[PDB]
Design an enzyme around this catalytic site. Sequence first.
Site, PDB file in Angstrom:
ATOM      1  N   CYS A 243       0.816  -1.213   0.000  1.00 54.11           N
ATOM      2  CA  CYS A 243       0.000   0.000   0.000  1.00 54.11           C
ATOM      3  C   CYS A 243       0.851   1.266   0.000  1.00 54.11           C
ATOM      4  O   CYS A 243       1.530   1.564   0.984  1.00 54.11           O
ATOM      5  CB  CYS A 243      -0.937   0.001   1.217  1.00 54.11           C
ATOM      6  SG  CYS A 243      -1.832   1.562   1.511  1.00 54.11           S
TER       7      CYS A 243
ATOM      8  N   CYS B 173       0.150   3.938   2.696  1.00 52.90           N
ATOM      9  CA  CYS B 173       0.566   3.400   3.991  1.00 52.90           C
ATOM     10  C   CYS B 173       2.043   3.705   4.245  1.00 52.90           C
ATOM     11  O   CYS B 173       2.422   4.188   5.317  1.00 52.90           O
ATOM     12  CB  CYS B 173       0.341   1.887   4.068  1.00 52.90           C
ATOM     13  SG  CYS B 173      -1.372   1.363   4.093  1.00 52.90           S
TER      14      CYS B 173
END
Lengths: 105, 105, 105, 105
Positions: C32, C35
């Site tokens: 991600c 993230c």
Amino acid sequence: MVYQVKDQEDFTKQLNEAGNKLVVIDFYATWCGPCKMIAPKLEELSQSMSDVVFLKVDVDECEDIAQDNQIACMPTFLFMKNGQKLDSLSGANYDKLLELVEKNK
Amino acid sequence: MVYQVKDQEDFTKQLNEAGNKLVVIDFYATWCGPCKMIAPKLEELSQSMSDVVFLKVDVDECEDIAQDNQIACMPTFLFMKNGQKLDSLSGANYDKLLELVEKNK
Amino acid sequence: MVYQVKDQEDFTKQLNEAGNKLVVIDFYATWCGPCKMIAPKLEELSQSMSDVVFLKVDVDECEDIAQDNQIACMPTFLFMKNGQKLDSLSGANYDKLLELVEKNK
Amino acid sequence: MVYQVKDQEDFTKQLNEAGNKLVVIDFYATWCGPCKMIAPKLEELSQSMSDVVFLKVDVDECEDIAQDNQIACMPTFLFMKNGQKLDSLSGANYDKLLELVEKNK
């Protein structure tokens, strides 16, 4: 009956009131199990022996007295006569308490 | 650092925050000589051992907690882990305290 | 420091050790982008705020925990205190994260 | 039926297999609630529209594909045709998914 010492001055008054009699003072706390177990036995001893005076001191209410007497375990029994310390007993040992009473009275 | 537990809930809170660490609890009184005698050593120990949680309970301030743990002789050191009792030591024996910390940490 | 929770029990353990502190949990994945984009900021924040506990859950490593918290968009920041949910933030919005930390700490 | 892409080479094989057809790829996770809710609708769309190909990619099984496609929310729908990206849709919005299908097919 076992009289509860209210403060230091009261302790002296009770020691004077005892005359020549052996005095057994129970240092105890309300949170102490062994103290509670033996109290009725002390009351019974108190009701039966007329030549011994039984007192009690709640260490949480009289912390000064507890400190002056170097209390560390509950219950502690102090044995006095004519103002003099004769013996001490740490813990709820009824037979040993009786021995000390018979010996010093 | 030896944290002073303020009451029953606070005791529970500290026991949770301990996670999986040994918790050592000193039940003491300010009128107790041996308690004051060993207090500084507990404090020194706690500054070194970050993997053990050290707590103290003033039995005059938290009589309910004292009753819960049937304290009798002081100081009493209670050893716990994950909210459960592991051992108990009556009296100010530093070597015994270290042995029990060593065994239970 | 942002601690990585290893599994369900470990999650529970960390939530207990938090005591009464705000706990902020970053649900993330190594694939991600956003993230990874915000991770260093969370780490910096956690080094400053010793009164807040910062945790992270890799959803690929702990799929069960992810399911428990119905994670959908990542990163997701879950705010908890005393084992109970307070708020939730989807996406890497640092200003919103600070606002929610400020509100809930 | 919705075919599950096994790896990158499989993804290319399926894109080739689709010919000139619009391809709708569902990036999902087994721990994702909204993903589960909409899957049956996708299967039904898959069974009914013969001019569209529906695929799915489990992000935990194909983290490389998830990363290469910048997936952040679950589910994410990627709309491709003749190897080209036409549109993306984040989240379980069935009506918007249908609009994109009608528009690009």
